[PDB]
RNA sequence: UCUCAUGGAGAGUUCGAUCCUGGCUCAGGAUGAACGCUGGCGGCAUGCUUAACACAUGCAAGUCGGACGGGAAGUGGUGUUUCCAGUGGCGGACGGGUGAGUAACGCGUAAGAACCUGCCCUUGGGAGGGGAACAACAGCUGGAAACGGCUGCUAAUACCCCGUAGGCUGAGAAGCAAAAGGAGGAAUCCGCCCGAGGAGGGGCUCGCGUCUGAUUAGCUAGUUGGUGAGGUAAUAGCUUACCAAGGCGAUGAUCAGUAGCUGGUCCGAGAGGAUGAUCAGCCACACUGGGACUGAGACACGGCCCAGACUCCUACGGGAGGCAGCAGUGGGGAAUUUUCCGCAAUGGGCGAAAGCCUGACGGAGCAAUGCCGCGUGGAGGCAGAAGGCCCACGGGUCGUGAACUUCUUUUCCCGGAGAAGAAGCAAUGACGGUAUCCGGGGAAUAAGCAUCGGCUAACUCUGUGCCAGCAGCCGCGGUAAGACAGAGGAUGCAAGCGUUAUCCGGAAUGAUUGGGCGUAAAGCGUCUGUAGGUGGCUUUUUAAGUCCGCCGUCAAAUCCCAGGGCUCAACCCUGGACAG
């Protein structure tokens, strides 16, 4: 399906990262949307990603008792690069 | 005399006899593998030239492979378990020879 | 294996079968892969949807005697 | 009131509390009378009411009302009790089914007989 | 005045009256219901919710002589044919029961990638040459039995060896691995070994959804990750050593408490609440705990081993066992059935087939447990008589009601015939001589139960006197009781009618739709401020929400719509779809 985009809370460990993914859900009864946040152990060979990074999160085989997810380069995001002003 | 429990009894006895066959076929493997590991330790530690010492080692290796597969097709083992036993032996045989000096792939 | 057989529906004394493609180890009325034929003795009602039948006979589904001979009457064994 | 506050689970129901805890989810229970005696009703209803104490199978002891006119019940009798409240007598939450087990039917009652456990007269 | 709507009811009770806030109570549905009274029939369903408490008896998994050596029944004999323990072959992992444990990827849904796979299809190649045993049997022997022990003996599709192999190990060099015959007079069939596919059945991983408790606040050290070696059918702290210090947590971790989950069911105008019997899927368990073995598949209900608890047999030395399989017994309990018939149908197992076995299933029996249908008569019947009850004694009312006269016979009774369900060779039916059909009698064989003060439809009189009693709530009852008990009369339902228990409703009474906080319950004593929520205007971008189209799926059964079949209905069957 669609992969999950998030930001990194912890880089400290080797070949891994700890991502936080925020999603909104329409709470079952009261029809307002809510932010629920979940954390993941993402496998990141090469340790390219630092803390604060905004990374896309992908699915693969189990690497550990926790990490199922491949850390993957940010998928599509709006350029924080300045644009013309006509 | 007339005996009726086919299912239970007959299957129980069969289970014994087959069990002993299986035990044999496995013991074989743990054994010949073990001799291989003794030969590999003895070679890893000392200095002989492999070209020479690999002959007894490969007689033992060929034996253990024979035991392995005989026990696959006799069917005490699952083939995919076999593959790992063999790959283990191959790996050790490859480990000692890098210590000594003949072969090292790098790219 | 996959079997094409009858599952018994309807009521006490009045019995009506569906012809179904289902794994041989599920119960007689248990869950199935596909519903195919319809059968019934008393109304003498019988008919089958043949594309499914053939697609299962092709993948190796084995019928049961009654069914076997139903497919016979409807000439599905000739096309095969 | 505030949405954000309801989403913290601010609406919780009051559960349904039974009027006859001693029955434990049953239509009737059987018990043995420990005592059979009279009590006076809360004023201004003056009379003498026929109540027994019954020790039940579910282990409880309760005080059950006995209906109709007159009765044969005495201690170590095995009766059958059912639910329902006598608004007069404080604490009395249970009746005693007449015509079953050790309670006989009311004698000579001609009307609404099923409520008292009496045969039809021929 | 097109389109949508097929839906939302109130009443009593605080006061001398009123208006309000607020509780209690009632009218309605539904049961796996129980109890009381009463009970004619048929149709389809249902039937230990409690003790996952104990179990006497009998039956619930076998089959293959066309793998094989034997011996035992006959026959005249190896021409015929049967049975039978034993080795081997597949099956006993399905089917059947239960809901104890489980707050978990267990379940529902939607994804993934590192796997396995007997039987069934599809396909590529093969099946040389030897040998060794072990039951059975024989002899000796130990045991009450259960079951054993020695020495001999033998066949095989059972074991072992060698040769060859589009496979496996490996960078390679190389190394390593298979077979089984039985039928038939032959053709040929069923098998056997190695690969490579298919479908189905399993194993794992992850998003989402998946009870109450803060008077439970910190929990975790193979714990969270990294490498090296091992292990698994496969990925993985699955294991182990070393290195690092992480992981989870006030959005509720951990701990305690309850609970199998889901299609669904019941209720609701809807939004949603409560629940998870029968029926169908998945999980878990098999006397209480733990192991593995065999095997494609089990950590195996009617298998093994051990420990424990309990029952039985014993000639005292030892053995045997596991109904939460179908019936059945005790026990607990308000409460839940026959130690039934049959493999004829469907489904399974084995077999070349003939066939054998199936307490799955198909049926019967018992029970108003529930839902649906029908009956207990139809038409006429002076307006005269007996009797009950009321009456200002005039009369009223039970009452066209009965009696009475005719018609009809579903049901009842006595005789006859008598199915489909059976499938393409005939044969083969447990149900059953049942369902249905034809004749003969004859109103003939069949109405109870609640209520009658308000809510709530239906009223008077005799008997009682704060007594006996009633009651869902208000409250009735101290001499004329429309509220007690009886009578007559009426009203409601009807083979059922009531009472109790349970759940939703009404309840806008936990409120999103849908309430409140000056005085009725309710604004922290007041600020500052962290997380969190919401946040002015204009242009652009993006497209997460949002919207529209198309596809996949959300099993079948159920609910909804449209037809069809049992004489109708309930019930069954076909087709299709909104929601979400
Ligand atoms: Mg062999
Ligand atoms: Mg026919
Ligand atoms: Mg209520
Ligand atoms: Mg007041
Ligand atoms: Mg008043
Ligand atoms: Mg109110
Ligand atoms: Mg009611
Ligand atoms: Mg009776
Ligand atoms: Mg039970
Ligand atoms: Mg027994
Ligand atoms: Mg039998
Ligand atoms: Mg024969
Ligand atoms: Mg035979
Ligand atoms: Mg054979
Ligand atoms: Mg012969
Ligand atoms: Mg035999
Ligand atoms: Mg089983
Ligand atoms: Mg089962
Ligand atoms: Mg059943
Ligand atoms: Mg899941
Ligand atoms: Mg699972
Ligand atoms: Mg979850
Ligand atoms: Mg096998
Ligand atoms: Mg050969
Ligand atoms: Mg060889
Ligand atoms: Mg022959
Ligand atoms: Mg021959
Ligand atoms: Mg639930
Ligand atoms: Mg360690
Ligand atoms: Mg439980
Ligand atoms: Mg409502
Ligand atoms: Mg049950
Ligand atoms: Mg079931
Ligand atoms: Mg038990
Ligand atoms: Mg094995
Ligand atoms: Mg298990
Ligand atoms: Mg078993
Ligand atoms: Mg058993
Ligand atoms: Mg039983
Ligand atoms: Mg009993
Ligand atoms: Mg009892
Ligand atoms: Mg029988
Ligand atoms: Mg059969
Ligand atoms: Mg059959
Ligand atoms: Mg077969
Ligand atoms: Mg049955
Ligand atoms: Mg009867
Ligand atoms: Mg009935
Ligand atoms: Mg009946
Ligand atoms: Mg009854
Ligand atoms: Mg009952
Ligand atoms: Mg008449
Ligand atoms: Mg007639
Ligand atoms: Mg025929
Ligand atoms: Mg007739
Ligand atoms: Mg009225
Ligand atoms: Mg009354
Ligand atoms: Mg009530
Ligand atoms: Mg007076
Ligand atoms: Mg007087
Ligand atoms: Mg009076
Ligand atoms: Mg008078
Ligand atoms: Mg009265
Ligand atoms: Mg009367
Ligand atoms: Mg409500
Ligand atoms: Mg509101
Ligand atoms: Mg209010
Ligand atoms: Mg005040
Ligand atoms: Mg106040
Ligand atoms: Mg203030
Ligand atoms: Mg304060
Ligand atoms: Mg502030
Ligand atoms: Mg802020
Ligand atoms: Mg903002
Ligand atoms: Mg704005
Ligand atoms: Mg469906
Ligand atoms: Mg219709
Ligand atoms: Mg019709
Ligand atoms: Mg349908
Ligand atoms: Mg949809």
């Amino acid at each position: 399906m669609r992969s999950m985009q998030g930001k990194v809370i912890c880089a400290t460990n080797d070949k891994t990262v700890n991502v936080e993914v925020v999603r909104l859900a329409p709470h079952p009864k009261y029809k307002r949307r809510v932010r629920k946040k979940k954390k993941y152990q993402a496998h990141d060979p090469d340790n390219q990603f630092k803390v604060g990074d905004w990374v896309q999160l992908d699915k693969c085989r189990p690497i550990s008792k926790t990490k199922t997810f491949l850390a993957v380069a940010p998928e599509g995001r709006q350029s924080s690069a300045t644009r013309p002003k006509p | 005399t007339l005996k009726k429990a086919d299912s239970a009894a007959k299957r129980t006895r069969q289970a014994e006899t087959r069990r002993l066959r299986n035990k044999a076929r496995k013991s074989e493997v743990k054994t010949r593998m073990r001799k291989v590991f003794e030969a590999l330790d003895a070679l890893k530690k000392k200095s002989g030239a492999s070209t020479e010492e690999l002959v007894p080692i490969d007689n033992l290796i060929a034996e253990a492979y024979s035991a392995i597969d005989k026990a696959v097709v006799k069917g005490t083992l699952h083939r995919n378990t076999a593959a790992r036993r063999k790959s283990r032996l191959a790996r050790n045989k490859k480990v000692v020879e890098i210590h000594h000096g003949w072969y090292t792939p790098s790219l | 294996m996959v079997k094409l057989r009858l599952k018994r529906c309807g009521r006490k004394q009045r019995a009506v079968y569906r012809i179904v493609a289902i794994d041989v180890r599920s119960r007689r009325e248990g869950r199935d892969l596909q519903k195919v034929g319809f059968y019934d003795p008393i109304k003498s009602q019988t008919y089958l949807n043949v594309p499914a039948i053939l697609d299962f006979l092709e993948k190796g589904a084995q019928p049961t005697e009654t069914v076997y001979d139903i497919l016979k009457r409807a000439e599905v064994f000739k096309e095969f | 009131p505030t949405i954000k506050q309801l989403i913290r689970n601010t609406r919780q129901p009051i559960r349904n509390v039974t009027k006859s805890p001693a029955l434990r989810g049953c239509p009737q229970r059987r018990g043995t009378c420990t005592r059979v005696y009279t009590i006076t009703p809360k004023k201004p209803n003056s009379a003498l009411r026929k109540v027994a104490r019954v020790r039940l199978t579910s282990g409880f002891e309760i005080t059950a009302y006995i209906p109709g006119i007159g009765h044969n019940l005495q201690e170590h009798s095995v009766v059958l009790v059912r639910g329902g409240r006598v608004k007069d007598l404080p604490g009395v939450r249970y009746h005693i089914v007449r015509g079953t087990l050790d309670a006989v039917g009311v004698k000579d009652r001609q009307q609404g007989r099923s409520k008292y456990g009496v045969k039809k007269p021929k």
Side-chain angles (χ1 to χ4, degrees), chain B residues 13-101:
Chain B
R13 320 144 167 179
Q14 289 186 340
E16 308 161 349
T17 296
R18 293 177 199 190
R19 174 216 185 181
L20 307 178
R21 298 204 182 94
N22 283 329
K23 229 189 139 193
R25 256 161 272 172
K26 285 185 198 173
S27 285
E28 242 192 40
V29 174
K30 176 57 189 185
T31 282
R32 293 215 214 137
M33 287 190 74
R34 195 187 161 196
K35 279 192 296 190
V36 152
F37 292 114
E38 312 292 353
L40 285 161
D41 305 330
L43 190 61
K44 167 76 180 193
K45 302 176 180 193
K46 310 183 171 184
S47 53
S50 225
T51 304
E52 335 174 338
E53 316 272 15
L54 266 196
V55 191
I57 273 175
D58 292 345
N59 296 328
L60 294 204
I61 277 173
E63 290 169 26
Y65 279 56
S66 189
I68 280 182
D69 278 358
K70 277 172 184 171
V72 151
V73 194
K74 292 304 181 180
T76 303
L77 200 81
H78 180 281
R79 66 200 159 198
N80 225 305
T81 325
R84 302 189 336 252
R85 298 315 172 76
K86 300 179 194 171
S87 178
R88 173 188 199 174
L89 296 196
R91 282 180 193 195
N92 287 289
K93 186 208 178 185
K94 266 192 186 190
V95 160
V96 284
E97 55 102 64
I98 275 183
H99 184 261
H100 305 97

Side-chain angles (χ1 to χ4, degrees), chain C residues 24-64:
Chain C
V24 83
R25 255 190 232 163
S26 27
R27 324 178 331 174
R28 93 126 169 279
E29 26 195 21
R31 202 195 164 200
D32 51 320
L33 335 156
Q34 184 65 29
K35 183 189 164 170
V36 179
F38 179 93
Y39 179 90
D40 169 16
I42 309 173
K43 280 189 179 188
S44 295
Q45 288 291 338
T46 303
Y47 71 103
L48 327 170
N49 151 77
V50 299
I53 301 171
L54 287 171
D55 301 330
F56 286 90
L57 286 183
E58 173 177 14
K59 294 179 185 178
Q62 296 297 348
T64 306

Side-chain angles (χ1 to χ4, degrees), chain C residues 3-12 15-32 64:
Chain C
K3 230 163 168 192
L4 301 171
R5 47 178 181 166
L6 306 185
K7 103 172 172 197
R8 192 182 182 295
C9 308
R11 325 168 303 183
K12 210 171 56 62
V16 177
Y17 309 96
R18 288 173 198 181
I19 305 189
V20 277
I22 115 190
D23 168 46
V24 83
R25 255 190 232 163
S26 27
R27 324 178 331 174
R28 93 126 169 279
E29 26 195 21
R31 202 195 164 200
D32 51 320
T64 306

Side-chain angles (χ1 to χ4, degrees), chain D residues 1 6 8-10 14 16 24 32 36-37 57 69 71 73 77 79 84 96 104 109 112 114 116 118-119:
Chain D
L6 313 175
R8 316 194 173 169
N9 169 235
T10 332
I14 308 167
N16 214 7
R24 263 173 198 173
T32 294
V36 187
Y37 71 98
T57 52
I69 291 192
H71 64 96
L73 302 187
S77 216
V79 315
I96 291 194
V104 300
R109 197 194 170 84
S114 76
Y116 299 90
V118 185
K119 291 302 175 193

